[PDB]
């Protein structure tokens, strides 16, 4: 755990996709939530408690990651993609959100160069993979399927 | 609910393409998936040709016809129709055309009186 | 439904008289309050009435210049209150036994007293 | 008996009747700089971003005014924000002590004699070796004579608190929003009464904007009614129930604290201040508010048209004022540019319905009890100059006597409460629910096992 | 997000399973779950820590909503349902539960009046749904199938 | 719902096996997750709030009741088993680890009587479970399989 956490980040996207559980990994698992797990009492949690103050925060910090987390499964488990690192879907591109061969985007481009590239159609993106399950769940609802 | 109305030759002779055709009244064939041809056979009984999703045009057909039949739409005319390839004596049967509604909520089936082919 | 009175009392003439009605089991808002006045050699007299909720007096018309109805409430306890009443200027003729009352369910525009107190009573 | 199989469903638009916690929100824009404002700073949550209402055909959902936790929530969190905007205050303890007192007798007009007090006292120092004289005015109703001898009246039972100089209790709208996983369902239909099958419905994210305002008798700055003047109550024929009224057209009433006044602080410890009342520059005369007379005559004829459709149309209305034996159940009680007023209403509330200016004279107060409670007081700041409030009354909160005689009357008078009844004025059209998304249901599909 | 939340609430069964997505959505996500996500700071926060009482209802609510979603999830997990908005299972319908055909309910009762006529089959239903799916896994371990 | 918790403890890996969903029900639901999902209000809920220090000592159960929860549903995401009680995998058993036959494991021991046998190969195997995921979506993304 930790050890080579953003170490992909200046690579290219085509190697930085078989990194990928080593940043998932680290979204739930900070060094509070290793100590609010030990079989004996962490022994700190007084301090916490005698100043109600530093105790919220630390709740904060806790929820926040949860909820962080739980969106984005819940936006996967609604793309149709539920588990998965990497899962396929039925929305083309367009070619107007970026217009890149995959010769050039998955070996010279980083994520990050990405990311500031197509930042302004992720919602478009979303919308349609959104749009793209509740088709297919309509057509499963046929059984005389395709 | 529809009408289904089969037409085409009775008659067809070795190795022609057997073509007919059926008009839909009543509701729209480039939608409702599940467009039909039956074969139903003296001395061998009823058989699927295969059929037609209106929505998409792909289509399915029994895999005893695999390399023999075809099965398209006119939406315009609002009719579907089989072709049938290299046609034998041993196709002579009655043929249907007919609506298969099948989903989590509903099931039934449309059919027409169909027609019937000699083949000599 | 329990209404518990204060005790005896006794006054200087032309000296007011408080007296008060502690009021629980039911809820103290809704159902008004009564008071009535019972002299040995004359009958009862109804004095007058306050409603509990908007803290209302209304009076018999003798006592406009003499007699105040309070009520104390506590939005927190539902079930418990009070009822005061100050009467000014107490004379000889004022010698009674002063009742708290209230009225029957459903008799809120109206008075006939279903539960009843002790009776003061004064001088 | 069709041969099917349960369907599992997960987003199903299915709700619950619910109790729950909102979280307040309010709209960031002049509000967002008044800074010390109380709402401003508790209802920190940004809102009304055009925000969404959304219209649902074909349902129908029971409502009622009456047992609306909402209600009872906002006045469980409007206590417990004035309690912590004072709990930090400066505590003035060492004023109880015996003040020596006499009338204030320059250029006072008749109907203020009396009213004011000029007390002068022995007060502590932040240096705790010294005691120095110092003087304040005060009203009559904030001191009790005892054995010239003077006392505050809040010494038998509790200490009192001074309100922060800069904070400000100003009722700035604010909405109240649902917490995820549940919804507020409105109630659109005109001329609704509070309670039963409301066959109009929408949802939203948050409630209007609502102000907070705080008054017995005579419902300020709320929403009018769409159409016509409403009469709400628990039950009609109950005279031991309120009667909310809403207007369908407001009432301008104009409230003023003439008296230039002026402030002093005086230290009474070490950092620890106390506000005084100085002398009052030009002349001194009461308090009142101006209510324009031919708009309240027109506004109690909406109101009696109304009230015939529950008592009877050959029934005489007629409008008295209120009886009883304190200030706080007899007089229009409200918070103006930051003073206690308790004004008189009996020029309001005196006419008989068979089928210029009205002046209320009106008394102040600085000692304020606030809310029902017997312990805590507050001691209101002095506010230098003069207050004027301009105000829209937006309904009212009557009583009924009882029945009277066999002449067939009726008689109304302005009506206490809890000021919970403040509240169900506005919360009256909303819901909260829960949201149940799973569900199940018979389908002709089957597992395929696989 | 929120553009049409309970509109399908009047509507026909049928017609509303096909809004799922919709309220799917809006389990985990309200307002001041949206002001916790921002990049810069919220502000407001220190009010709720100055304030601790006020901070303490804040978790609460949110930390509710995430117990409730979770909850949802673990019985579409043990009932065999993982992700899906619809699923189905070899639990036969009864015909004592309701005794209705499949044209009768599809096409004229709403999502509520169907909640309110099967309420007390509810802990039935769901306690036969994972019964069916212990029996489907004892099924599994088996290499000769069915 | 715990009507036999802990009822397979001291029975057989085998028989126990069969009793997986009774545990997972209740690793999400406590007393307290149950009363503060009422209808009503609670009533409680004043006490906690006028005492801060016992809010936050009942949150912070509820929260790491969450976080554990998740935990464990996010190993068995990166491990290729989404869903399921029982999974298989590509992994082999090393024979070092424990050396036993599979008819004295199954039918001899418990499952606490495993659990202090192989407690110190614990990370080994999830290492491995790991990294047999991550090659197989490598052979995933390749169009001619295996
Ligand atoms: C909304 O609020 C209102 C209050 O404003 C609630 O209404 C009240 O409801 C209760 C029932 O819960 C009624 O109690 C019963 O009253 C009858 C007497 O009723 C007759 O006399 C009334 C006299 O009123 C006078 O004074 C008023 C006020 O100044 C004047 O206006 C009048 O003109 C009179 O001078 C009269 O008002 C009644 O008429 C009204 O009501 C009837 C319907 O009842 C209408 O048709 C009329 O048009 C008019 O509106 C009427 O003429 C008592 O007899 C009852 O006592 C019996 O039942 C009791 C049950 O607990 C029992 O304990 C008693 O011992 C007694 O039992 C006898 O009868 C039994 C029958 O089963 C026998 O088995 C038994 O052996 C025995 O013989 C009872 O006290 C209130 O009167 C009523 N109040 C008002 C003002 O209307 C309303 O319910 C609330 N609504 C909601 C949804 O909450
Ligand atoms: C029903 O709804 C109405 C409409 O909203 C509402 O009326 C309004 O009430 C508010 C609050 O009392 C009034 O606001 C005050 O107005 C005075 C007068 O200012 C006039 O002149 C200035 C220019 O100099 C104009 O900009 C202004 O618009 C006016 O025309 C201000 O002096 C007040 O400011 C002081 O008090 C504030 C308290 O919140 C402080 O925040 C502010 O900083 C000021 O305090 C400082 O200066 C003081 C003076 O030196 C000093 O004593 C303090 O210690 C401190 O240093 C304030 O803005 C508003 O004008 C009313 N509107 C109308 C049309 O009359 C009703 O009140 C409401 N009814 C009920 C029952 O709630
Ligand atoms: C409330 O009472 C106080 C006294 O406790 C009043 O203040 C006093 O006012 C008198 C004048 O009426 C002052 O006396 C005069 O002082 C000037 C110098 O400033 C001197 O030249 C005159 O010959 C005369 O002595 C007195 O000093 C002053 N005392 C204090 C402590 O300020 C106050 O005006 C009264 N207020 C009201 C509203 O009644
Ligand atoms: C940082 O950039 C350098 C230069 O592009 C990358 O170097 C490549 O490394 C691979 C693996 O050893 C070689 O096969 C390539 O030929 C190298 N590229 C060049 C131009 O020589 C380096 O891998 C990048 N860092 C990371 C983490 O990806
Ligand atoms: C402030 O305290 C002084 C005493 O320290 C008070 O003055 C005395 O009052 C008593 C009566 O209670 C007289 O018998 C003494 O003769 C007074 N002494 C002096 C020096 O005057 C004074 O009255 C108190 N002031 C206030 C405003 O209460
Ligand atoms: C609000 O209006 C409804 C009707 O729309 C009133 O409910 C009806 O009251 C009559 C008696 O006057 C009963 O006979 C009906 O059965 C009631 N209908 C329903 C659906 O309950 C309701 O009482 C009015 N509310 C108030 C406070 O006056
Ligand atoms: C309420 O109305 C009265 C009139 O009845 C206003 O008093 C007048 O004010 C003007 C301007 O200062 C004077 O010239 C008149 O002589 C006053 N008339 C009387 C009878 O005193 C009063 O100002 C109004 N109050 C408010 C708050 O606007
Ligand atoms: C309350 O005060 C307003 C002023 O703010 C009064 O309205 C003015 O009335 C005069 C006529 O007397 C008009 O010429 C002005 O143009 C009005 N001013 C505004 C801003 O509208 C109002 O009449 C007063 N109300 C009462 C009951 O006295
Ligand atoms: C309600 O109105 C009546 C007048 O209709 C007020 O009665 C007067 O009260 C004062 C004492 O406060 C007496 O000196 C008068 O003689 C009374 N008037 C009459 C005609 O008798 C009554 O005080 C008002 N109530 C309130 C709370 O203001
Ligand atoms: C509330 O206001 C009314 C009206 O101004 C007051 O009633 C008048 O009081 C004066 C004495 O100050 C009497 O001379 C009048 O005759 C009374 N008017 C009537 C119609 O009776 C009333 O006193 C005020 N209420 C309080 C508690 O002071
Ligand atoms: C309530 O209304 C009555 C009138 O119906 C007021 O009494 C009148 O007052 C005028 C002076 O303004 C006198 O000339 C009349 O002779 C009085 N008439 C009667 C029948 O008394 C009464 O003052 C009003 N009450 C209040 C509190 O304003
Ligand atoms: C209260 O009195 C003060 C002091 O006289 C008034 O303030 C003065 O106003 C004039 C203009 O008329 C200015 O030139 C002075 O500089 C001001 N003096 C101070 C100390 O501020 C004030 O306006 C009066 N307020 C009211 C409402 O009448
Ligand atoms: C009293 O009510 C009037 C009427 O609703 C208010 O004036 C309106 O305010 C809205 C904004 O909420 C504007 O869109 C309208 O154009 C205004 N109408 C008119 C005729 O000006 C008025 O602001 C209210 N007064 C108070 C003190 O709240
Ligand atoms: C509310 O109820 C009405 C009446 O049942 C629904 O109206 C149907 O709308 C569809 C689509 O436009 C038409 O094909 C049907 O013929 C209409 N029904 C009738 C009887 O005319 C309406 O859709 C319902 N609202 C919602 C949100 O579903
Ligand atoms: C506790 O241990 C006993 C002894 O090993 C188990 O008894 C077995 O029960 C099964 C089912 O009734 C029988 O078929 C076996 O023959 C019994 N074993 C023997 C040696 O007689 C008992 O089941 C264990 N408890 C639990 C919960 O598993
Ligand atoms: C959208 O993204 C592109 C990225 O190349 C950027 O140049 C453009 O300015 C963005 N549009 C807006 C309105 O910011
Ligand atoms: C007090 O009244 C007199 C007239 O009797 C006047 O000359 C003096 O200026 C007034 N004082 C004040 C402060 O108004
Ligand atoms: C002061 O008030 C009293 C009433 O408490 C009164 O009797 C006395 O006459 C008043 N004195 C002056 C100067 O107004
Ligand atoms: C309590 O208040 C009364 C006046 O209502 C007063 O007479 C009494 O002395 C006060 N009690 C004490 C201890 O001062
Ligand atoms: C108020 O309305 C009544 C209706 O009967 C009328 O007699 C009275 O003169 C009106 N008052 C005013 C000031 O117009
Ligand atoms: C069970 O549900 C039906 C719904 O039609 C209802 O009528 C019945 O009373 C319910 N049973 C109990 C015990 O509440
Ligand atoms: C590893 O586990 C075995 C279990 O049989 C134990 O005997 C051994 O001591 C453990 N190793 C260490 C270093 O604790």
């Known amino acids: 755990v930790f050890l080579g956490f953003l170490g992909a980040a200046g690579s290219t996207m085509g190697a930085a996709s078989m990194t990928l559980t080593v940043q998932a990994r680290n979204l739930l698992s900070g060094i509070v939530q290793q100590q609010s797990n030990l079989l004996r009492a962490p022994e700190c949690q007084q301090h916490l408690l005698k100043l109600t103050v530093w105790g919220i925060k630390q709740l904060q910090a806790r929820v926040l990651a949860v909820e962080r987390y739980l969106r984005d499964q819940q936006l996967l488990g609604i793309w149709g993609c539920s588990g998965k690192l990497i899962c396929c879907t039925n929305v083309p591109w367009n070619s107007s959100w970026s217009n890149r061969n995959l010769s050039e985007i998955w070996d010279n481009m980083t994520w990050l160069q990405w990311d500031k590239e197509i930042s302004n159609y992720t919602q478009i993106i979303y919308g349609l993979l959104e749009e793209s399950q509740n088709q297919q769940e309509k057509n499963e609802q046929d059984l005389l399927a395709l | 609910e529809v009408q289904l109305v089969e037409s085409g030759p009775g008659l067809v002779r070795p190795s022609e393409t057997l073509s007919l055709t059926c008009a839909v009244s009543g509701d729209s064939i480039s939608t409702n998936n599940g467009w039909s041809w039956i074969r139903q056979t003296p001395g061998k009984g009823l058989e699927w040709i295969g059929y037609i999703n209106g929505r998409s045009g792909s289509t399915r057909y029994n895999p005893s016809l695999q390399s023999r039949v075809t099965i398209s739409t006119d939406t315009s005319g609002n009719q579907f129709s089989l072709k049938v390839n290299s046609v034998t004596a041993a196709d002579t049967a009655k043929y249907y055309c007919?609506?298969?509604?099948?989903?989590?909520?509903?099931?039934?089936?449309?059919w027409g009186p169909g027609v019937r082919v000699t083949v000599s | 439904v329990q209404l518990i009175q204060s005790g005896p009392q006794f006054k200087t003439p032309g000296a007011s008289v408080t007296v008060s009605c502690k009021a629980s089991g039911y809820i103290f808002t809704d159902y008004l309050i009564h008071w009535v006045r019972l002299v040995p050699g004359k009958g009862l007299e109804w004095l007058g009435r306050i409603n509990t909720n908007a803290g209302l007096m209304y009076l018999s018309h003798k006592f406009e210049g003499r007699l105040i109805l309070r009520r104390v409430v506590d939005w927190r306890t539902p079930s418990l209150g009070t009822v005061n009443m100050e009467l000014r200027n107490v004379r000889s003729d004022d010698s009674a036994i002063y009742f708290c009352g209230r009225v029957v369910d459903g008799f809120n525009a109206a008075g006939p007293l279903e539960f009843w107190g002790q009776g003061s009573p004064v001088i | 008996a069709e041969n099917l199989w349960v369907t599992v469903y997960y987003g199903v638009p299915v709700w619950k009747d619910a109790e729950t916690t909102l979280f307040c929100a309010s709209d960031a824009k002049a509000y967002e700089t008044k800074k010390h404002n109380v709402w401003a700073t508790h209802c920190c949550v940004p809102t009304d971003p055009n925000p969404q209402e959304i219209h649902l055909e074909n349902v129908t959902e029971e409502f009622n005014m009456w047992k609306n936790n909402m209600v009872e929530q906002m006045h469980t969190d409007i206590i417990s924000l004035w309690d912590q905007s004072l709990k930090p205050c400066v505590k003035l303890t060492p004023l109880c002590v015996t003040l020596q007192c006499t009338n204030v007798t320059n250029n006072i007009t008749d109907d203020m004699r009396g009213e004011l007090k000029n007390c002068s006292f022995n007060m502590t120092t932040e240096l705790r070796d010294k005691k120095q004289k110092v003087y304040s005015l005060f009203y009559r109703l904030d001191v009790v004579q005892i054995n010239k001898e003077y006392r505050l009246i809040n010494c038998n039972t509790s200490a009192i608190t001074q309100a922060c100089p800069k904070v400000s209790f100003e009722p700035i709208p604010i909405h109240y929003c649902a917490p995820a996983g549940f919804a507020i369902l409105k109630c659109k239909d005109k001329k609704f009464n509070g309670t039963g099958p409301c066959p109009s419905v929408s949802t939203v994210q948050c409630t209007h904007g609502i102000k907070p305002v705080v008054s017995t008798q005579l419902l300020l700055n709320g929403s009018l009614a769409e159409e016509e003047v409403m009469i709400r109550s628990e039950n009609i024929t109950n005279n031991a129930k309120n009667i909310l009224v809403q207007f369908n057209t407001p009432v301008q009433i104009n409230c003023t604290r003439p008296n230039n006044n002026t402030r002093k602080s005086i230290r009474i410890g070490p950092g620890q201040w106390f506000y005084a009342t100085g002398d009052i520059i030009g002349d001194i005369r009461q308090a009142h508010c101006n209510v324009s007379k031919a708009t309240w005559n027109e506004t109690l004829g909406k109101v009696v048209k109304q009230l015939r459709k529950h008592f009877g149309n050959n029934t005489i209305i007629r409008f008295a004022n209120s009886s009883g034996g304190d200030l706080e159940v007899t007089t229009h009680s409200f918070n103006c540019g930051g003073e206690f007023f308790y004004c008189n209403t009996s020029g309001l509330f005196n006419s008989t319905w068979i089928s210029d200016s009205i002046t209320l004279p009106c008394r102040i107060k600085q000692i304020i009890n606030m809310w029902q409670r017997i312990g805590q007081a507050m001691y209101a700041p002095p506010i230098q100059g003069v207050i004027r409030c301009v105000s829209n009354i937006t309904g009212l909160i009557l009583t009924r006597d009882g029945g009277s005689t066999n002449s067939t009357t009726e008689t109304f008078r302005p009506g206490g409460g809890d000021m919970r009844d403040n509240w169900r004025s506005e919360l009256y059209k909303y819901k909260v629910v829960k949201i149940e998304p799973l569900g199940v249901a018979p389908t002709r599909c089957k597992r395929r096992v696989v | 997000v929120f553009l049409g939340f309970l509109g399908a609430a009047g509507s026909t069964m049928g017609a509303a399973s096909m809004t799922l997505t919709v309220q799917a959505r809006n389990l985990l996500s309200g307002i001041v779950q949206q002001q916790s996500n921002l990049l810069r700071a919220p502000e407001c926060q220190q009010h709720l820590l100055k304030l601790t009482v006020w901070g303490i209802k804040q978790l609460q609510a949110r930390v509710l909503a995430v117990e409730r979603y979770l909850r949802d999830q673990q019985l579409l997990g043990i009932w065999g349902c993982s992700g899906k908005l619809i699923c189905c299972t070899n639990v036969p319908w009864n015909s004592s539960w309701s005794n209705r055909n499949l044209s009768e309910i599809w096409d004229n009762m709403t999502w509520l009046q169907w909640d309110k006529e099967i309420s007390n089959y509810t802990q039935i239903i769901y306690g036969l749904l994972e019964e069916s799916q212990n029996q489907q896994e004892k099924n599994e371990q088996d290499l000769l199938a069915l | 719902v715990f009507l036999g918790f802990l009822g397979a403890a001291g029975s057989t890996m085998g028989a126990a096996s069969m009793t997986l969903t009774v545990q997972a029900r209740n690793l999400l639901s406590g007393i307290v997750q149950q009363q503060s999902n009422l209808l009503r209000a609670p009533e409680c809920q004043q006490h906690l709030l006028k005492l801060t220090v016992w809010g936050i000592k009942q949150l912070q159960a509820r929260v790491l009741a969450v976080e554990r929860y998740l935990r464990d549903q996010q190993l068995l995401g990166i491990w290729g088993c989404s869903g399921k009680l029982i999974c298989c995998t590509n992994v082999p058993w090393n024979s070092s680890w424990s050396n036993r036959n599979l008819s004295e494991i199954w039918d001899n021991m418990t499952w606490l009587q495993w659990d202090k046998e192989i407690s110190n190969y614990t990370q080994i195997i999830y290492g491995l479970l790991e990294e047999s995921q991550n090659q197989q979506e490598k052979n995933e993304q390749d169009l001619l399989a295996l």
């Open positions: 007919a609506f298969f509604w099948s989903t989590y909520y509903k099931r039934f089936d449309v």
